[PDB]
């Protein structure tokens, strides 16, 4: 409990939550605003945690010169509630950014008013060589996707076929078929560390509880790397399967009490 | 009517003028329902004018001559309500507490879904009334709903919440209207009544369901101002005295249901 | 013209135009008056009109090459000198794309600026085709470009050379030789109408007077249209900025005092 | 010495130790250049350390032995400013009102001019201020002024029975207020500043700059007076004069060098 000024004050909770399954952990962060002077309850959730990358190398089939990588093509972060008395007010980040570091700060000042102060938290994240924007927002949920954008190797694209392929065509190691790790980015040899906010207001006396689910997860693509040889100069030459296992995600759902600030996990997949 | 309003886009209209005689309130709605194949869900943006009676009145207190009282608006009320999960408000105009005695806004609507306030526009639609001596602002808002307050403010200077607005000027006279102020020193928002111009805009997620009902609210808070004869150690004179939101939400509410396919309009009731 | 929001606004204007640069500047002085603000704050709303400007005519004794010269971009520009005044906001403030900008700056007592108000500015422009983007800015200034953005024709960008060229290779009248008014965007068959904010704060006691520089102006770019028979047609070609930074600049020196504000000078 | 922290982008390093037996106080800066291609600006990290003296002393009043005082530090004043236009007050740490016994927080960098309060460089501050609260109190592109203030021991840090001792009848002045062990470490011993300011220089403008730190106290005196209700049952009553001895600083110019990062000491007071 904080006091950030007369007659308001922050009730703070937390919930720690992962799943081997998905390989996942979720870390939130519950500030409840009791502001007297501000005609709605507020909460600010601030979703952090940790998405592996599970990014796997491996043969193709019973081939000698086909192997592949499974990667994080892009990372999920969402948020949502049905509760008919919530609206979503706020989130960062809103807008569409590629920073190597995404840092932002939300400001609350007593009477009701945020600025996307008496009050203030802030998210901050890396996301080297890719890119975050909303895919989706309304005033009961918003998504959030952060995927491969641009990367110097020359520069390439998310897209490019042969974006990771390795210098090895002759190695039966599936890892040598594509670059290492020294020449990859955090998002996809390790995982995503997820830094975000949003802020939902909650008609005051219309129920002391809301469920809100919030979901991290990842679509993966599979990178076929095949020998190809010249001259008798062999090289290793790159195919895609976009979208190949999308949305492996690991969703929880989490009760809010207005009245007591209790926080109950509901359930999780 | 339909309108074109450009690159596949046209805008349907519909009116709805509803009044009732115990509230003394007329509901002239407008529905412009905004068909852009380009914008990933419907569309309708509400104009709310109409005419909301003052329904001043002025009588004797109980029992006694030398008290007398005006009970008149301090407030009128101006709402828009929903119920439609699929339903979420875009805009509304005034957005902001404004003062000035005439307010003039309009709406753009660019295609792609983009409205904006405050020839470049595929389709607009404008609000504008009069508040001489009131002042407007949004009491609260939501996804679902915006309700308006405009108060009395400020009329030497005096604000609405001065004890001894309006009192007049006829300590002796048995006629309760001769212990307030002449009409012509009251502005039309007390004499007469109001003549609201708002604007509302709200976003229906297609293939959710053909129907969505709204809420519309006018109405006024009325205060009472009681005026008690003062006699000095001979002369005479009037010193008011005040009952703040004596009478609150007096208001008119009808409730429309709207087709977001067939765009008919009709009344499922009111009050 | 004073508004109480127990602090209050006390609101100034000024309008100044030049027949020479073919602009005029409507500027809006708003004064904050908050005890519990331990700073003077002053939130300038910039409107007005920049005339376009767009001409068309004959090139050299041809007949053949005819010309149009156009804004490719428009310039908006706050500058002050006294080290005692900071811009803290400005709107907006960043890059955007919508045909329609409109944004609103709210204020609370205590100093608290929104980037429900006790006083609230708006701003509200089109640039159909157009986007807008700070250039620069720092403590003492802020600089807006909006330039030509995309074209609706296909689509075009706007540095494609062949971009507005016309239908009519053979006339003689070189308004014929580009497209007519009704597919050319109002910035550009008129002039673009300002709105922008900005709200600097001043240290209390430091000075009671503050200059003020504001620019409006626009960058030229010349798209030559050349007949070629193959039936004939016209090819463009471009000089971009062909005329850079033809800018109305307007100094305005206001009072913290007594609020008086003064036009000390332009070009 | 020099520091690499990526493409193109490197940190000057240079300190300064002043001191004051006047003042009580010690100045211990680091100064920080941070160098880099991708960022069009000169940029300077400053975190100022060292050591304040309470300079708590207790005294009798004039002519009496029945009233003594207690002389001590209400506020710690830490302040940075620079007169030079071409410099521009980027940020600085703590940058909110926070009371919690310490604080530690940490500025990231990531080249391209990007500052975070995972990253290129960093740098942090950490310090311990209990019963006290820090705050802003003034600030402007040209400087930044913290205060570090009595807050909370219960009762507010404006009591004037706050420190009151318990022998009224002592000659001793030091004996009319509560025992050092009963005191915080920034009344009985002194404040170990940590603060952080980010500045910025437009290059080519001028190949120095002149910055103004200030540490000092603001010192209140708070006289305890015996009262007796009746023969020989007496106790300790306070009274306050708040604000007796303000902005009782330490302040040392420093004049930085832009292009050949030298350091040098104008002078001080």
Do not use: C
């Not at 081997?20 to 979703?47: E, H, P, R, S």
């Not at 078929?177 to 390790?190: G, I, K, Q, T």
């Amino acid at each position: 409990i904080e006091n950030i000024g007369d007659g308001a004050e922050v009730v703070k909770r937390t919930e720690d939550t992962s799943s081997d399954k998905w390989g996942v952990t979720q870390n939130i962060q519950f500030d409840f605003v009791k502001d007297k002077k501000y005609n709605k309850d507020a909460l600010i959730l601030k979703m952090q945690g940790f998405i592996n990358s599970k990014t796997t190398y491996y043969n193709y089939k019973n081939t000698d010169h086909i192997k592949a990588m499974r990667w994080p093509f892009q990372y999920n972060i969402g948020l949502k509630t049905n509760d008919p008395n919530v609206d979503l007010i706020n989130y960062l980040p809103k807008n569409k950014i590629d920073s190597v570091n995404v840092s932002q700060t939300l400001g609350y000042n007593i009477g009701g008013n945020f600025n996307s102060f008496n009050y203030s938290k802030t998210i901050s994240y890396n996301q080297q060589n890719y890119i975050s924007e909303v895919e989706h927002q309304n005033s009961k949920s918003v998504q959030w996707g952060i995927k491969a954008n641009s990367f110097i190797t020359g520069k390439m694209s998310g897209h490019d076929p042969n974006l990771f392929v390795g210098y090895k065509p002759y190695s039966q190691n599936p890892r040598d078929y594509f670059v290492p790790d020294n020449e990859l980015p955090p998002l996809v040899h390790s995982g995503f560390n997820p830094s975000f906010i949003a802020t939902v207001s909650h008609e005051k006396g219309s129920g002391d509880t809301s469920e809100f689910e919030i979901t991290y997860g990842r679509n993966m693509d599979v990178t076929h790397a095949t020998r190809r040889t010249t001259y008798g100069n062999s090289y290793l030459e790159g195919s895609r399967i976009h979208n190949a296992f999308v949305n492996r995600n690991y969703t929880v759902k989490y009760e809010v009490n207005w009245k007591t600030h209790e926080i109950k996990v509901k359930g999780h997949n």
